[PDB]
Amino acid sequence: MRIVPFGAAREVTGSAHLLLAGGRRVLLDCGMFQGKEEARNHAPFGFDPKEVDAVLLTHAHLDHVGRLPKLFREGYRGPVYATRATVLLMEIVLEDALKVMDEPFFGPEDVEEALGHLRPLEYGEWLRLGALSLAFGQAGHLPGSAFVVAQGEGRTLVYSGDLGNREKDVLPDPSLPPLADLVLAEGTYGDRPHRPYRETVREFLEILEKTLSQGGKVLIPTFAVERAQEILYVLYTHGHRLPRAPIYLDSPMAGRVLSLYPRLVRYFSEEVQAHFLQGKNPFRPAGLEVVEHTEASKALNRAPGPMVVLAGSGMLAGGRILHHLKHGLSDPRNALVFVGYQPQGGLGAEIIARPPAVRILGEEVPLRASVHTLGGFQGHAGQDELLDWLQGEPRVVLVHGEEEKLLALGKLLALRGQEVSLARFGEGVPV
Ligand SMILES: [Zn+2]
Ligand SMILES: [Zn+2]
């Protein structure tokens, strides 16, 4: 039994791992590369998409399912297993990536074909391929997110997929992995533990009351798949003490994803499921409004506060958010609230460096609005959480993370008596 890293090696995008065991070929995730690696979605997989017997998807994020339609474009016709939640989100994620893509490396025919082979596989349901047994464990990272347990040939392998930040309230805690002979694990934040959740929420509420009370705007860059709805959830459960103000989810996609949540009630934490039981959707704070088109979106720029605005892209690469930033950053009464990791050298970091001005949409804009970074809303397990999850596991191969971050984590694993390496592209490892 061998596992061959075919992406996310010494990097964060491109998650795709081929499992060779029991005389079968099972692909674990099939994400696209993103950002600077984006061009590599055009390059070949490094394996034959026709010899694959079946593929398992840990979750709907584009960096785990984005190359799936390419797998089908190039021949594959096997089954694609994923939890109902991932299956349903996957549709919104792929359609969108298609419509919003410069150099598309697949077409509508491939998305359709790909979605056509999705088969529901919930947690604790065993899959049988040859003499190989595979099951999903709770990863608590996205509704329907899971880690993979592959047992066969007398051995056990565990692919973590992306592990969640167990401190937040929306998703159920990540389950412990079973004792395994080999663990393929992410290490996005292998270099440090994250800021505590409760304290980030309090701080968040402090920021809201202050700027909303003075008639200012609270601008929030958010990814549309799950971070946006988590913010609305915090806004919903604390709406009793926040000043009245319209909440604009200025993101069609975030909207489509949100409309889907009521159907995924069983995929949330007990806290969230208990709210739905009371008969009320905890992801729709009072005053919520999903903005569908550009005209109303831009009208928000010249309208006065108080208001809360959630918009993408989550890392200021593009999206309506730039238009809000452009027109709101120069007003001292407004506040910018980052609820996620800002890439090095990006407009995010540049703003945090707090210069006298910033360049947004071909224009220099005075930066007077207050700026706040709430690291606590982070969606991946931090270093300390990675350690606990990995406790007692004999061997560990690291993927999904920048080199230095995988190393810092590697160090601690090593000093703990655990054997570890940094998965290399194309180089398989013995389970
Ligand atoms: Zn993810
Ligand atoms: Zn990922």
Short mmCIF file of C-alpha atoms and ligand atoms in Angstrom, two decimals:
data_model
loop_
_atom_site.label_atom_id
_atom_site.label_comp_id
_atom_site.label_asym_id
_atom_site.label_seq_id
_atom_site.Cartn_x
_atom_site.Cartn_y
_atom_site.Cartn_z
CA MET A 1 0.00 0.00 0.00
CA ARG A 2 1.50 3.31 -1.15
CA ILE A 3 0.27 6.92 -1.28
CA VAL A 4 1.61 9.28 -3.96
CA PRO A 5 1.45 13.05 -3.30
CA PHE A 6 0.19 14.66 -6.49
CA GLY A 7 -0.26 18.17 -5.18
CA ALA A 8 -0.10 20.26 -2.02
CA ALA A 9 3.55 19.25 -1.51
CA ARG A 10 5.53 22.13 0.01
CA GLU A 11 2.53 24.30 -0.96
CA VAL A 12 -1.15 24.85 -0.11
CA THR A 13 -3.10 24.40 -3.35
CA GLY A 14 -3.53 21.42 -5.69
CA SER A 15 -4.54 18.78 -3.14
CA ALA A 16 -4.65 15.41 -4.93
CA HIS A 17 -3.23 12.14 -3.63
CA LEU A 18 -3.22 8.77 -5.37
CA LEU A 19 -3.55 5.65 -3.22
CA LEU A 20 -2.07 2.45 -4.68
CA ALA A 21 -3.30 -0.54 -2.70
CA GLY A 22 -5.11 -3.87 -2.93
CA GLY A 23 -4.57 -3.75 -6.69
CA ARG A 24 -6.66 -0.57 -6.98
CA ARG A 25 -5.97 3.12 -7.64
CA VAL A 26 -7.98 5.52 -5.44
CA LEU A 27 -7.51 9.29 -5.78
CA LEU A 28 -7.92 11.33 -2.56
CA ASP A 29 -9.09 14.85 -3.56
CA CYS A 30 -8.55 16.58 -6.87
CA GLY A 31 -8.10 20.28 -6.21
CA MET A 32 -6.84 22.92 -8.57
CA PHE A 33 -3.77 25.04 -7.94
CA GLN A 34 -4.51 28.68 -7.22
CA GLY A 35 -2.84 32.06 -7.28
CA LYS A 36 0.68 32.00 -8.70
CA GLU A 37 0.48 28.22 -9.27
CA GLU A 38 -2.78 28.62 -11.22
CA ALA A 39 -1.09 27.98 -14.61
CA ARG A 40 -0.27 24.42 -13.49
CA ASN A 41 -3.95 23.46 -13.77
CA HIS A 42 -3.14 23.26 -17.48
CA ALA A 43 -0.21 20.88 -16.93
CA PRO A 44 -0.75 17.09 -16.68
CA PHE A 45 -1.62 15.28 -13.45
CA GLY A 46 1.48 13.10 -13.36
CA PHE A 47 -0.66 9.96 -13.43
CA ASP A 48 -3.13 8.31 -15.81
CA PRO A 49 -6.68 9.49 -15.00
CA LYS A 50 -7.94 6.33 -16.67
CA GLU A 51 -6.34 3.86 -14.31
CA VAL A 52 -8.12 5.42 -11.33
CA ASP A 53 -10.73 3.07 -9.85
CA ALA A 54 -12.48 5.70 -7.73
CA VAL A 55 -11.99 9.09 -6.14
CA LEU A 56 -12.84 10.34 -2.64
CA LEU A 57 -13.39 14.06 -1.91
CA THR A 58 -12.72 15.44 1.59
CA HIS A 59 -14.63 18.68 1.02
CA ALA A 60 -15.98 21.18 -1.48
CA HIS A 61 -13.23 23.84 -1.46
CA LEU A 62 -11.93 24.62 -4.96
CA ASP A 63 -8.39 23.64 -3.94
CA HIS A 64 -9.62 20.07 -3.30
CA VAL A 65 -12.17 19.61 -6.12
CA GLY A 66 -11.14 22.19 -8.72
CA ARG A 67 -9.34 19.74 -11.02
CA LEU A 68 -12.05 17.10 -10.85
CA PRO A 69 -13.69 18.18 -14.10
CA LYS A 70 -10.25 17.92 -15.72
CA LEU A 71 -10.02 14.35 -14.47
CA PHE A 72 -13.27 13.67 -16.38
CA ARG A 73 -12.31 15.76 -19.41
CA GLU A 74 -9.27 13.52 -19.76
CA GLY A 75 -11.08 10.19 -19.66
CA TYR A 76 -11.93 9.15 -16.10
CA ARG A 77 -15.44 7.75 -15.66
CA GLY A 78 -15.22 6.10 -12.26
CA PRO A 79 -17.32 6.94 -9.18
CA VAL A 80 -16.66 10.05 -7.10
CA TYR A 81 -17.51 9.69 -3.41
CA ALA A 82 -18.14 12.62 -1.06
CA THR A 83 -20.62 13.44 1.74
CA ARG A 84 -23.99 14.83 0.61
CA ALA A 85 -22.92 18.24 1.94
CA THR A 86 -19.74 18.27 -0.16
CA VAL A 87 -21.81 16.93 -3.09
CA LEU A 88 -24.26 19.81 -2.82
CA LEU A 89 -21.65 22.55 -2.18
CA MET A 90 -19.43 21.11 -4.94
CA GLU A 91 -22.05 22.13 -7.48
CA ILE A 92 -22.03 25.81 -6.47
CA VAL A 93 -18.21 25.79 -6.22
CA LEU A 94 -17.60 24.31 -9.70
CA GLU A 95 -20.29 26.29 -11.56
CA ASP A 96 -18.84 29.45 -10.10
CA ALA A 97 -15.20 28.63 -10.86
CA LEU A 98 -16.25 27.99 -14.44
CA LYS A 99 -18.10 31.29 -14.92
CA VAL A 100 -15.33 33.19 -13.12
CA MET A 101 -12.21 31.88 -14.81
CA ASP A 102 -9.74 33.54 -17.17
CA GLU A 103 -8.07 30.56 -18.82
CA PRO A 104 -10.58 27.77 -18.14
CA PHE A 105 -8.91 24.34 -18.33
CA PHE A 106 -12.25 22.54 -18.63
CA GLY A 107 -15.72 23.34 -19.87
CA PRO A 108 -19.42 23.01 -18.93
CA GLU A 109 -19.43 19.54 -20.47
CA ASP A 110 -16.83 18.40 -17.92
CA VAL A 111 -18.53 19.91 -14.87
CA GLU A 112 -21.77 18.19 -15.82
CA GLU A 113 -19.95 14.92 -16.44
CA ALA A 114 -18.07 15.25 -13.15
CA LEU A 115 -21.12 16.05 -11.03
CA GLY A 116 -22.77 13.13 -12.79
CA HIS A 117 -20.57 10.62 -10.98
CA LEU A 118 -20.91 11.96 -7.46
CA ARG A 119 -22.04 9.30 -4.98
CA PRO A 120 -23.00 10.04 -1.35
CA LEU A 121 -20.79 8.46 1.31
CA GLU A 122 -21.46 9.69 4.83
CA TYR A 123 -19.26 9.40 7.92
CA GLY A 124 -18.90 5.87 9.23
CA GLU A 125 -19.94 4.27 5.95
CA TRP A 126 -17.40 1.83 4.64
CA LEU A 127 -16.44 1.69 0.99
CA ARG A 128 -15.19 -1.60 -0.48
CA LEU A 129 -12.69 -1.61 -3.34
CA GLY A 130 -10.89 -4.89 -3.92
CA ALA A 131 -9.53 -5.89 -0.52
CA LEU A 132 -9.40 -2.23 0.50
CA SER A 133 -11.70 -0.57 3.07
CA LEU A 134 -12.24 3.23 3.16
CA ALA A 135 -14.25 5.50 5.46
CA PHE A 136 -14.81 9.19 6.33
CA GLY A 137 -13.96 10.65 9.72
CA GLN A 138 -15.24 14.03 10.98
CA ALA A 139 -12.80 16.80 10.00
CA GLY A 140 -14.84 19.80 11.24
CA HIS A 141 -13.48 22.14 8.58
CA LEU A 142 -16.44 22.58 6.17
CA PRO A 143 -19.99 21.27 6.24
CA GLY A 144 -19.42 17.67 5.12
CA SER A 145 -15.63 17.87 5.51
CA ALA A 146 -13.79 14.64 6.31
CA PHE A 147 -10.46 12.93 6.68
CA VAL A 148 -9.91 9.51 5.03
CA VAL A 149 -9.28 6.18 6.73
CA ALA A 150 -7.82 3.62 4.28
CA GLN A 151 -7.23 0.12 5.58
CA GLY A 152 -5.99 -2.82 3.53
CA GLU A 153 -3.01 -5.16 3.10
CA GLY A 154 -2.76 -5.41 6.88
CA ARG A 155 -2.10 -1.68 7.29
CA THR A 156 -3.92 1.57 8.05
CA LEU A 157 -3.47 5.00 6.41
CA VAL A 158 -5.11 8.27 7.38
CA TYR A 159 -5.39 11.28 5.05
CA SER A 160 -6.42 14.30 7.14
CA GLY A 161 -7.82 16.50 4.39
CA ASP A 162 -8.12 19.95 5.98
CA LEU A 163 -8.68 19.87 9.73
CA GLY A 164 -10.90 22.48 11.32
CA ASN A 165 -10.32 24.97 14.13
CA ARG A 166 -12.11 23.18 16.97
CA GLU A 167 -12.58 26.44 18.92
CA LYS A 168 -15.25 27.93 16.66
CA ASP A 169 -18.98 27.22 17.08
CA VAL A 170 -20.41 26.44 13.64
CA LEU A 171 -18.87 23.07 12.81
CA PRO A 172 -18.67 19.99 15.04
CA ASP A 173 -15.24 19.19 16.51
CA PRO A 174 -12.74 17.28 14.37
CA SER A 175 -12.67 13.62 15.39
CA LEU A 176 -9.40 12.02 16.49
CA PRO A 177 -7.91 9.83 13.77
CA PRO A 178 -7.58 6.12 14.50
CA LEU A 179 -4.08 4.81 15.32
CA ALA A 180 -2.49 4.40 11.86
CA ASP A 181 0.72 3.16 10.25
CA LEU A 182 0.89 6.36 8.25
CA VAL A 183 -0.78 9.76 8.47
CA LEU A 184 -0.78 12.14 5.50
CA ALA A 185 -1.48 15.45 7.23
CA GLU A 186 -1.91 19.12 6.41
CA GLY A 187 0.14 21.77 8.17
CA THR A 188 -1.18 25.09 6.85
CA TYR A 189 -0.41 26.70 10.24
CA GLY A 190 2.30 24.34 11.42
CA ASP A 191 4.39 27.22 12.76
CA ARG A 192 1.99 28.55 15.43
CA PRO A 193 -1.21 28.13 17.51
CA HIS A 194 -4.10 30.44 16.58
CA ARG A 195 -5.53 33.28 18.68
CA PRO A 196 -8.33 32.16 21.08
CA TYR A 197 -11.87 32.20 19.70
CA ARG A 198 -13.86 33.73 22.55
CA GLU A 199 -11.52 36.73 22.76
CA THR A 200 -11.70 37.34 19.01
CA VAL A 201 -15.50 37.36 19.16
CA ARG A 202 -15.61 39.84 22.06
CA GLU A 203 -13.14 42.07 20.26
CA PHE A 204 -15.29 41.72 17.12
CA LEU A 205 -18.41 42.82 18.99
CA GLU A 206 -16.51 45.73 20.51
CA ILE A 207 -15.52 46.88 17.02
CA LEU A 208 -19.08 46.60 15.72
CA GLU A 209 -20.82 48.58 18.48
CA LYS A 210 -18.26 51.34 18.32
CA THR A 211 -18.27 51.95 14.56
CA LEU A 212 -22.00 51.28 14.06
CA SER A 213 -22.89 53.64 16.94
CA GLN A 214 -21.06 56.47 15.21
CA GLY A 215 -22.77 55.81 11.91
CA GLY A 216 -19.74 54.26 10.28
CA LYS A 217 -19.27 51.22 8.09
CA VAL A 218 -17.78 47.89 9.12
CA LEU A 219 -16.21 46.36 5.96
CA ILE A 220 -15.40 42.62 6.15
CA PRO A 221 -13.46 40.70 3.46
CA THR A 222 -14.83 37.15 3.37
CA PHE A 223 -14.54 33.95 1.42
CA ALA A 224 -17.95 32.95 0.11
CA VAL A 225 -17.96 29.27 1.02
CA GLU A 226 -18.10 29.25 4.79
CA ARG A 227 -16.33 32.15 6.49
CA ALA A 228 -19.09 34.52 5.35
CA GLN A 229 -21.85 32.47 6.89
CA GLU A 230 -19.86 32.04 10.11
CA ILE A 231 -19.68 35.82 10.51
CA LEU A 232 -23.47 36.08 9.97
CA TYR A 233 -23.86 33.40 12.65
CA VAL A 234 -21.87 35.44 15.18
CA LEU A 235 -23.94 38.42 14.12
CA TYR A 236 -27.09 36.40 14.68
CA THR A 237 -26.39 35.15 18.18
CA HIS A 238 -25.24 38.58 19.36
CA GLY A 239 -27.75 40.66 17.41
CA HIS A 240 -29.59 41.41 20.65
CA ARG A 241 -26.85 43.76 21.83
CA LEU A 242 -25.71 45.25 18.53
CA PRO A 243 -27.08 48.55 17.26
CA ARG A 244 -29.65 48.15 14.50
CA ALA A 245 -28.03 48.32 11.09
CA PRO A 246 -28.46 46.65 7.73
CA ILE A 247 -26.09 43.72 7.16
CA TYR A 248 -25.13 43.36 3.46
CA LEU A 249 -23.76 40.03 2.21
CA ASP A 250 -22.49 41.66 -0.98
CA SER A 251 -21.73 38.29 -2.59
CA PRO A 252 -24.11 36.34 -4.87
CA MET A 253 -22.17 33.16 -4.30
CA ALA A 254 -22.08 33.56 -0.53
CA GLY A 255 -25.81 33.89 -1.01
CA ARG A 256 -26.22 30.67 -2.98
CA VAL A 257 -24.12 28.87 -0.38
CA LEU A 258 -26.20 30.40 2.42
CA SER A 259 -29.55 29.33 0.83
CA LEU A 260 -28.10 25.81 0.94
CA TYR A 261 -27.38 25.76 4.66
CA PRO A 262 -30.92 24.90 5.88
CA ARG A 263 -30.59 21.67 3.85
CA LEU A 264 -27.30 20.87 5.63
CA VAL A 265 -28.54 21.25 9.20
CA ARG A 266 -27.17 17.83 10.18
CA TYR A 267 -23.65 18.85 9.16
CA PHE A 268 -23.27 21.54 11.82
CA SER A 269 -22.33 21.52 15.51
CA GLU A 270 -24.84 20.55 18.19
CA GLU A 271 -25.17 24.23 19.10
CA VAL A 272 -26.22 25.11 15.51
CA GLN A 273 -28.47 22.06 15.12
CA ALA A 274 -30.26 22.99 18.36
CA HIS A 275 -31.01 26.45 16.91
CA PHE A 276 -32.57 24.96 13.76
CA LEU A 277 -34.68 22.75 16.03
CA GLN A 278 -36.17 25.86 17.66
CA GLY A 279 -37.39 26.56 14.13
CA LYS A 280 -35.05 29.50 13.42
CA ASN A 281 -32.17 29.78 10.91
CA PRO A 282 -29.16 31.08 12.95
CA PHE A 283 -27.33 32.19 9.79
CA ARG A 284 -29.75 35.01 9.01
CA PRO A 285 -29.18 37.83 11.47
CA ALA A 286 -31.91 40.44 11.55
CA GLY A 287 -31.40 42.98 8.79
CA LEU A 288 -29.54 40.66 6.42
CA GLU A 289 -29.72 41.51 2.74
CA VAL A 290 -27.95 39.60 -0.04
CA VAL A 291 -26.87 42.03 -2.76
CA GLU A 292 -27.14 40.42 -6.18
CA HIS A 293 -25.95 43.00 -8.68
CA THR A 294 -23.33 45.67 -9.32
CA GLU A 295 -25.64 48.68 -9.28
CA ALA A 296 -26.85 48.14 -5.72
CA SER A 297 -23.38 46.98 -4.72
CA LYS A 298 -21.75 50.20 -5.89
CA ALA A 299 -24.63 52.27 -4.46
CA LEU A 300 -23.47 51.07 -1.06
CA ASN A 301 -20.18 52.97 -1.59
CA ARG A 302 -21.90 56.35 -1.60
CA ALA A 303 -24.61 55.53 0.95
CA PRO A 304 -24.00 56.51 4.58
CA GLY A 305 -23.50 54.11 7.45
CA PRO A 306 -24.34 52.53 9.83
CA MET A 307 -23.90 49.22 8.04
CA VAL A 308 -21.97 45.97 8.08
CA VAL A 309 -20.63 44.79 4.69
CA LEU A 310 -19.38 41.27 3.92
CA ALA A 311 -17.74 40.95 0.50
CA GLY A 312 -15.09 39.00 -1.41
CA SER A 313 -12.61 38.12 -2.49
CA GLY A 314 -11.41 37.14 0.96
CA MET A 315 -7.83 38.17 0.21
CA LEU A 316 -8.49 41.36 -1.75
CA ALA A 317 -7.39 39.79 -5.04
CA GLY A 318 -10.49 41.18 -6.73
CA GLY A 319 -14.23 41.27 -6.08
CA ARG A 320 -16.71 43.90 -4.90
CA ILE A 321 -14.76 44.30 -1.68
CA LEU A 322 -12.12 46.40 -3.46
CA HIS A 323 -14.83 48.87 -4.43
CA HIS A 324 -15.96 49.22 -0.82
CA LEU A 325 -12.36 49.55 0.40
CA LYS A 326 -11.71 52.17 -2.25
CA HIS A 327 -14.57 54.40 -1.06
CA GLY A 328 -14.55 53.63 2.64
CA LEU A 329 -10.92 53.40 3.69
CA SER A 330 -10.57 57.21 3.64
CA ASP A 331 -13.21 57.76 6.32
CA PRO A 332 -11.96 57.54 9.96
CA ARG A 333 -15.38 56.44 11.17
CA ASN A 334 -15.23 53.24 9.12
CA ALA A 335 -13.42 50.08 10.17
CA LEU A 336 -11.86 47.20 8.22
CA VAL A 337 -12.08 43.76 9.85
CA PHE A 338 -9.99 40.94 8.47
CA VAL A 339 -11.48 37.61 9.56
CA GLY A 340 -8.89 35.46 7.86
CA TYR A 341 -5.22 35.04 6.90
CA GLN A 342 -3.85 37.76 4.59
CA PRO A 343 -1.12 36.60 2.15
CA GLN A 344 2.39 38.02 2.33
CA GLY A 345 2.93 40.95 -0.03
CA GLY A 346 -0.77 41.29 -0.80
CA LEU A 347 -2.95 44.39 -0.48
CA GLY A 348 -4.09 42.84 2.77
CA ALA A 349 -0.63 42.97 4.38
CA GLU A 350 0.11 46.33 2.75
CA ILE A 351 -2.92 47.89 4.47
CA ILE A 352 -2.00 46.31 7.80
CA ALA A 353 1.44 47.94 7.47
CA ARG A 354 -0.72 51.05 7.76
CA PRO A 355 0.91 53.46 5.27
CA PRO A 356 -0.42 56.99 4.82
CA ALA A 357 -2.12 55.82 1.61
CA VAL A 358 -2.84 52.69 -0.43
CA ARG A 359 -3.33 51.95 -4.12
CA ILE A 360 -6.75 50.42 -4.86
CA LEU A 361 -8.24 50.22 -8.34
CA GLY A 362 -5.58 52.39 -9.97
CA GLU A 363 -5.85 55.14 -7.37
CA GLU A 364 -4.11 56.23 -4.17
CA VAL A 365 -6.52 56.20 -1.23
CA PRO A 366 -5.86 57.83 2.16
CA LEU A 367 -6.06 55.19 4.91
CA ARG A 368 -7.96 56.68 7.86
CA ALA A 369 -10.42 53.88 8.63
CA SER A 370 -9.38 51.77 11.60
CA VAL A 371 -7.91 48.38 10.72
CA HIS A 372 -8.36 45.19 12.73
CA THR A 373 -7.19 41.62 12.17
CA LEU A 374 -9.16 38.95 14.03
CA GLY A 375 -6.98 35.88 13.65
CA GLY A 376 -9.35 33.90 15.85
CA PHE A 377 -11.73 33.28 12.93
CA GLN A 378 -9.05 31.09 11.29
CA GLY A 379 -10.45 27.93 9.64
CA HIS A 380 -7.56 25.43 10.01
CA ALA A 381 -6.28 23.69 13.12
CA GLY A 382 -3.37 25.65 14.55
CA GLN A 383 -0.01 24.13 15.44
CA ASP A 384 -1.10 23.04 18.92
CA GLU A 385 -4.27 21.44 17.54
CA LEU A 386 -2.26 19.63 14.83
CA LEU A 387 0.01 18.23 17.57
CA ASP A 388 -2.90 16.87 19.65
CA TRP A 389 -4.55 15.33 16.61
CA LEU A 390 -1.26 13.65 15.64
CA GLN A 391 -0.41 12.52 19.19
CA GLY A 392 0.77 8.91 19.35
CA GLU A 393 0.93 8.46 15.56
CA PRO A 394 4.24 6.71 14.63
CA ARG A 395 4.87 8.12 11.14
CA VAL A 396 3.75 11.41 9.56
CA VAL A 397 4.14 12.86 6.05
CA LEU A 398 3.28 16.56 5.75
CA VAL A 399 1.48 18.26 2.89
CA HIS A 400 -0.67 21.36 2.48
CA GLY A 401 1.43 24.26 3.72
CA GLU A 402 4.43 26.45 2.96
CA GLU A 403 7.76 24.65 3.46
CA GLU A 404 8.88 26.59 6.54
CA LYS A 405 5.52 26.00 8.18
CA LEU A 406 5.57 22.27 7.51
CA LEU A 407 9.13 22.20 8.91
CA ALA A 408 8.38 24.08 12.15
CA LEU A 409 5.65 21.50 12.71
CA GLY A 410 8.02 18.73 11.55
CA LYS A 411 10.52 19.80 14.22
CA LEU A 412 8.13 19.31 17.08
CA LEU A 413 6.95 16.01 15.68
CA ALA A 414 10.56 14.86 15.36
CA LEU A 415 11.49 15.90 18.91
CA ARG A 416 8.42 14.02 20.07
CA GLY A 417 9.75 10.75 18.69
CA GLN A 418 7.59 10.70 15.58
CA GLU A 419 9.08 9.95 12.16
CA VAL A 420 8.26 12.69 9.67
CA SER A 421 8.98 13.93 6.17
CA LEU A 422 7.69 16.52 3.75
CA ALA A 423 5.87 14.78 0.93
CA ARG A 424 7.49 15.40 -2.45
CA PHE A 425 5.58 15.65 -5.70
CA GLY A 426 5.19 12.33 -7.51
CA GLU A 427 7.19 10.48 -4.84
CA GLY A 428 5.01 7.84 -3.22
CA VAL A 429 5.38 6.63 0.37
CA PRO A 430 4.90 3.14 1.86
CA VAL A 431 1.97 2.83 4.25
ZN ZN B 1 -10.60 23.65 2.79
ZN ZN B 2 -7.31 22.96 1.35
#
